[PDB]
Amino acid sequence: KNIESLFDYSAGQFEFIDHLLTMGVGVHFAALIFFLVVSQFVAPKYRIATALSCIVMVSAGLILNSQAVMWTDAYAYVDGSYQLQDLTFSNGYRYVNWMATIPCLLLQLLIVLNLKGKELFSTATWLILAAWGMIITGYVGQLYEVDDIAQLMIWGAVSTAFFVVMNWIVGTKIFKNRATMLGGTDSTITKVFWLMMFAWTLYPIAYLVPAFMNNADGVVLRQLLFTIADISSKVIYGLMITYIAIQQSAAAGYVPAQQALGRI
Ligand SMILES: *C/C=C(C)/C=C/C=C(C)/C=C/C1=C(C)CCCC1(C)C
Ligand SMILES: CCCCCCCC/C=C\CCCCCCCC(=O)O
Ligand SMILES: [Cl-]
Ligand SMILES: [Cl-]
C-alpha cells in the first residue's frame, strides 16, 4: 500500500537510504548520552524536560533502527538492482511512534514554559488530543498513497486542521508565557517556536511525496526529509529545550546549573 513497494532500487538509492537511517540512529543515541550527563545540572522543576529528551532519543533512535533493519530485510540485490523480497517496508510504523514521541516533545516545552498544576494538565491534554487527531488521520491517509491519492489528500487536509490548531495552542502558550522565563530564555523560546514550525512542517511535505514525486527518487527524497525533520524536531529542539532548562535553573539559583555554565 506504500509507494516504496512499487519500485526496484539502484545500489546507490538503496545504500543511501540505509546510510540515512543508520546515521539517524547514531545521532539520536549520541545525543542521548549528552542529555543524560547534563541532566544533573538541571533544577528539579525542569529536570523532567531533559529526561523527556532522553526518552525521545531512544524512541526515535529505535524507530530509525527498526526502519533500517526492515529496509535491509525487505530488499535483496537481484539481477542488478535491489528488489522486494518476502518481508515488507513501510513508513506506517513512524506514525505509530509519533503517538508517543510528539506528546513527549510537547510536554517538555510546557515544562520550560513554567506551566504548572491545572494549566499544565489541561494544556497537555488538549495538545495531546490535537496531536493524536493529526497523527491518526494522517496514518489513515497514507494507507491510500498508492491506491487513492484523492483520499490521501482529503485525510491530509483533516490532519492539517489538527496540525494548525495544535500549533496555535503551542504559539499561544509560548508567546503568553514568554514573560515568565528567566535568564534571557524569553528570547530563546521564541526561536524554539519557529524551529517547531519549520521542522514539523517537513512531515506533511514528506506525506505528499507520493502525489508530486511517485518514483524511486521520491522514496529517497521522503527519507531525506524525515532525516532533516527528525534531527531538527528532536535533537536540535531537545538541545534548545535543555539549554533553556539549564539557563532558567541557574537564574533560579540552582548551583550545579550555575557551576556548569561557569565552566563554559
Ligand atoms: C519527531 C516527529 C515529529 C515531530 C513528527 C511530526 C509529525 C507531523 C507534524 C505530521 C503532520 C502531518 C500532517 C500535518 C498532514 C499529513 C499527515 C501528517 C501526520 C504527516
Ligand atoms: C539538520 C540537517 C541534517 C541533514 C541530514 C542529511 C545529511 C545527508 C544529506 C544528503 C546529501 C545529498 C546526498 C546526494 C544524494 C544522491 C542521490 C542518490 O544517490 O540517490
Ligand atoms: Cl527546582
Ligand atoms: Cl519518532
Short mmCIF file of all heavy atoms in Angstrom, two decimals, residues 7 34 47 49 57 61 86 88 95 103 105-106 111 118 120-121 140 164 172 199 203 216 220 225 260:
data_model
loop_
_atom_site.label_atom_id
_atom_site.label_comp_id
_atom_site.label_asym_id
_atom_site.label_seq_id
_atom_site.Cartn_x
_atom_site.Cartn_y
_atom_site.Cartn_z
N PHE A 7 8.77 0.01 -6.46
CA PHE A 7 9.98 0.18 -7.25
C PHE A 7 11.12 -0.75 -6.88
O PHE A 7 11.19 -1.25 -5.76
CB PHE A 7 10.47 1.63 -7.14
CG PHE A 7 9.36 2.64 -7.24
CD1 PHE A 7 8.95 3.35 -6.12
CD2 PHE A 7 8.72 2.86 -8.45
CE1 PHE A 7 7.92 4.27 -6.21
CE2 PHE A 7 7.69 3.78 -8.55
CZ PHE A 7 7.29 4.48 -7.42
N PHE A 34 24.57 12.76 25.75
CA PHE A 34 24.72 14.16 26.13
C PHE A 34 23.61 14.62 27.08
O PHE A 34 23.89 15.25 28.10
CB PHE A 34 24.73 15.08 24.90
CG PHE A 34 24.79 16.54 25.25
CD1 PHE A 34 26.01 17.14 25.54
CD2 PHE A 34 23.63 17.30 25.31
CE1 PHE A 34 26.07 18.47 25.88
CE2 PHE A 34 23.69 18.64 25.65
CZ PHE A 34 24.91 19.23 25.93
N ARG A 47 13.94 19.21 35.40
CA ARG A 47 14.77 18.05 35.07
C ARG A 47 14.04 17.04 34.18
O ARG A 47 14.65 16.37 33.34
CB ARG A 47 15.26 17.37 36.35
CG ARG A 47 16.45 16.44 36.13
CD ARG A 47 17.06 15.99 37.45
NE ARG A 47 17.59 17.11 38.22
CZ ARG A 47 17.46 17.24 39.54
NH1 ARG A 47 16.81 16.33 40.25
NH2 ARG A 47 17.99 18.29 40.16
N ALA A 49 12.12 17.80 31.78
CA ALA A 49 12.19 18.26 30.40
C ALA A 49 13.41 17.65 29.70
O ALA A 49 13.35 17.33 28.52
CB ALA A 49 12.24 19.79 30.34
N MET A 57 15.03 10.49 22.38
CA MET A 57 16.21 9.98 21.69
C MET A 57 16.14 8.46 21.50
O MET A 57 16.43 7.95 20.42
CB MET A 57 17.50 10.34 22.43
CG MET A 57 17.89 11.82 22.39
SD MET A 57 17.90 12.55 20.74
CE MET A 57 16.37 13.48 20.75
N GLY A 61 15.41 6.83 18.05
CA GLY A 61 16.53 6.01 17.64
C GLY A 61 16.11 4.58 17.36
O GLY A 61 16.62 3.94 16.44
N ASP A 86 10.32 -11.10 0.54
CA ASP A 86 9.15 -11.61 1.25
C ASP A 86 8.69 -10.63 2.33
O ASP A 86 7.49 -10.46 2.56
CB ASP A 86 9.46 -12.97 1.87
CG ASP A 86 9.84 -14.00 0.83
OD1 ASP A 86 9.30 -13.93 -0.29
OD2 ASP A 86 10.68 -14.87 1.14
N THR A 88 8.35 -6.83 4.21
CA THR A 88 7.88 -5.55 3.69
C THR A 88 8.51 -4.36 4.41
O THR A 88 9.01 -4.47 5.53
CB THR A 88 6.35 -5.44 3.80
OG1 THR A 88 5.97 -5.59 5.18
CG2 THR A 88 5.68 -6.51 2.97
N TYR A 95 4.39 6.63 12.11
CA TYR A 95 3.17 7.26 12.58
C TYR A 95 2.76 6.74 13.96
O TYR A 95 2.38 7.51 14.84
CB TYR A 95 2.03 7.03 11.58
CG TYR A 95 2.19 7.83 10.30
CD1 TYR A 95 3.17 7.50 9.37
CD2 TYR A 95 1.36 8.91 10.03
CE1 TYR A 95 3.32 8.24 8.20
CE2 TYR A 95 1.50 9.64 8.86
CZ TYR A 95 2.48 9.30 7.96
OH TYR A 95 2.63 10.03 6.80
N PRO A 103 3.72 13.70 21.95
CA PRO A 103 3.39 14.16 23.31
C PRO A 103 4.61 14.48 24.16
O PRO A 103 4.54 15.42 24.94
CB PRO A 103 2.61 12.97 23.89
CG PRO A 103 1.95 12.37 22.71
CD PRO A 103 2.95 12.49 21.59
N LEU A 105 7.56 15.62 23.10
CA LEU A 105 8.12 16.88 22.62
C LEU A 105 7.29 18.04 23.15
O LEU A 105 7.83 19.07 23.55
CB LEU A 105 8.18 16.91 21.10
CG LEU A 105 9.12 15.91 20.42
CD1 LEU A 105 8.86 15.87 18.92
CD2 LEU A 105 10.58 16.24 20.70
N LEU A 106 5.97 17.87 23.15
CA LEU A 106 5.07 18.93 23.62
C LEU A 106 5.19 19.14 25.12
O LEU A 106 5.16 20.28 25.62
CB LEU A 106 3.63 18.60 23.23
CG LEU A 106 3.38 18.60 21.72
CD1 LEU A 106 2.01 18.00 21.39
CD2 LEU A 106 3.49 20.01 21.17
N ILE A 111 6.89 22.34 30.14
CA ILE A 111 7.66 22.37 31.38
C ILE A 111 8.58 23.59 31.44
O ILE A 111 8.59 24.29 32.46
CB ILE A 111 8.47 21.08 31.55
CG1 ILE A 111 7.53 19.89 31.74
CG2 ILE A 111 9.41 21.19 32.75
CD1 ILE A 111 8.15 18.57 31.43
N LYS A 118 -2.87 22.67 37.27
CA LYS A 118 -4.09 22.59 36.47
C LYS A 118 -3.88 23.01 35.03
O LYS A 118 -4.32 22.33 34.10
CB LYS A 118 -5.19 23.44 37.11
CG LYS A 118 -6.54 23.33 36.42
CD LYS A 118 -7.33 22.15 36.97
CE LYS A 118 -8.67 22.01 36.25
NZ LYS A 118 -8.49 21.64 34.82
N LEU A 120 -1.11 23.09 33.39
CA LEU A 120 -0.21 22.13 32.74
C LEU A 120 -0.98 20.90 32.27
O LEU A 120 -0.86 20.49 31.11
CB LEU A 120 0.93 21.72 33.68
CG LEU A 120 1.86 20.64 33.13
CD1 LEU A 120 2.60 21.13 31.89
CD2 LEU A 120 2.84 20.16 34.19
N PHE A 121 -1.78 20.32 33.16
CA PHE A 121 -2.56 19.14 32.84
C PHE A 121 -3.58 19.39 31.73
O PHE A 121 -3.70 18.59 30.79
CB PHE A 121 -3.28 18.61 34.08
CG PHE A 121 -4.21 17.46 33.79
CD1 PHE A 121 -3.72 16.17 33.69
CD2 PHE A 121 -5.57 17.68 33.62
CE1 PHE A 121 -4.57 15.11 33.42
CE2 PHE A 121 -6.42 16.62 33.35
CZ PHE A 121 -5.92 15.34 33.25
N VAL A 140 -4.20 7.12 8.54
CA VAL A 140 -5.24 6.61 7.64
C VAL A 140 -5.01 7.10 6.22
O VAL A 140 -5.14 6.34 5.26
CB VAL A 140 -6.65 7.04 8.11
CG1 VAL A 140 -7.70 6.61 7.09
CG2 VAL A 140 -6.96 6.43 9.46
N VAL A 164 -2.69 22.62 12.49
CA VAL A 164 -2.79 24.07 12.62
C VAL A 164 -3.34 24.48 14.00
O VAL A 164 -2.83 25.41 14.63
CB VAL A 164 -3.67 24.66 11.50
CG1 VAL A 164 -4.03 26.11 11.79
CG2 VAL A 164 -2.96 24.54 10.16
N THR A 172 0.24 30.16 21.23
CA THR A 172 -0.47 30.92 22.24
C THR A 172 0.21 30.78 23.60
O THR A 172 0.46 31.77 24.28
CB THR A 172 -1.95 30.49 22.36
OG1 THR A 172 -2.63 30.79 21.13
CG2 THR A 172 -2.63 31.23 23.50
N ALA A 199 10.45 22.67 11.32
CA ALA A 199 10.74 21.23 11.34
C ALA A 199 9.50 20.36 11.21
O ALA A 199 9.51 19.37 10.50
CB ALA A 199 11.50 20.87 12.60
N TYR A 203 7.16 17.18 7.72
CA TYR A 203 6.47 15.90 7.74
C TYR A 203 5.27 15.85 6.78
O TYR A 203 5.13 14.88 6.03
CB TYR A 203 6.04 15.54 9.17
CG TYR A 203 7.22 15.24 10.08
CD1 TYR A 203 7.73 16.22 10.92
CD2 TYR A 203 7.84 14.00 10.08
CE1 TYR A 203 8.81 15.97 11.74
CE2 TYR A 203 8.92 13.72 10.90
CZ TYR A 203 9.40 14.72 11.73
OH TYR A 203 10.48 14.47 12.56
N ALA A 216 11.15 6.15 -7.50
CA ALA A 216 12.18 5.72 -6.55
C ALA A 216 12.95 6.90 -5.95
O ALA A 216 13.33 6.87 -4.78
CB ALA A 216 13.14 4.73 -7.22
N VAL A 220 13.56 8.24 -1.98
CA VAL A 220 14.77 8.77 -1.36
C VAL A 220 14.50 10.14 -0.75
O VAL A 220 14.91 10.41 0.38
CB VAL A 220 15.93 8.87 -2.38
CG1 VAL A 220 17.14 9.53 -1.74
CG2 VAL A 220 16.30 7.49 -2.92
N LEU A 225 13.87 13.97 3.78
CA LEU A 225 13.04 14.93 4.51
C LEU A 225 12.81 14.48 5.96
O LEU A 225 12.93 15.29 6.88
CB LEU A 225 11.70 15.13 3.80
CG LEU A 225 11.73 15.89 2.47
CD1 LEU A 225 10.37 15.80 1.77
CD2 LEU A 225 12.13 17.34 2.69
N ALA A 260 27.89 24.67 36.09
CA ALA A 260 28.02 24.09 34.76
C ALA A 260 28.23 25.17 33.70
O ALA A 260 29.12 25.05 32.85
CB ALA A 260 26.80 23.25 34.42
#
